[PDB]
Design a binder for these strands. Sequence first.
DNA 1: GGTTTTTGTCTGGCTTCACACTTGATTTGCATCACTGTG
DNA 2: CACAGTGATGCAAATCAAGTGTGAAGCCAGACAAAAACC
Length: 160
Amino acid sequence: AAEFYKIFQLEIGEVYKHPNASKEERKRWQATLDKHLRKRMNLKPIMRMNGNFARKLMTQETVDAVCELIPSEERHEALRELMDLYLKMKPVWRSSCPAKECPESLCQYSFNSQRFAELLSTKFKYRYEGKITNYFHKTLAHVPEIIERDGSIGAWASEG
DNA sequence: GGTTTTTGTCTGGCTTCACACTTGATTTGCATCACTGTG
DNA sequence: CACAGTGATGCAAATCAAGTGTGAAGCCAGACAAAAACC
């Protein structure tokens, strides 16, 4: 979700049309996103991101509120489908027992991963060519093997 | 079988607690509300 | 889909206070009378 914050922060300025930008433009995008977040979702800017911020910003209303700052309807649809895919994927690895708490999300995880992969490769070409983050690689590749090997993922987390 | 312990009873009579109703008049319990905090 | 708080508020539910005449239970008397675990 911190990387999604960065994605919104970069896309609010329409980087896909302007490949080059200055740190002043980056700070402008920072300020606009932070203001609109505090105005609509009642959040605050935080220096290093935490779990409560992650859960709040991984909501459909996050994109439903940030689309007002970007003009492109194609970008609106792309962000909406990206958020939908991530929210479908989250219960698989956050469930305390995915075999008896989200079988519908477990049965189509591979198809959702393929759709997310193709969307990242095509519609967000400006960031994910030759560089993909560790956590997206893990989430898109190794989750079904982990759930088949162990039985659950969220039970073995470090929140305790 | 003996021996000791462990429970059972006997009826008249005593105290002690629960209840039978009803109409309010409190007092107790538990869910709601949007949030933090360790990352 | 982290989970245990954080306190004020509000409504459902439990307890009760008033009245007297009952039932139901526990126990007192001293004595007689069956089960049961070791020889």
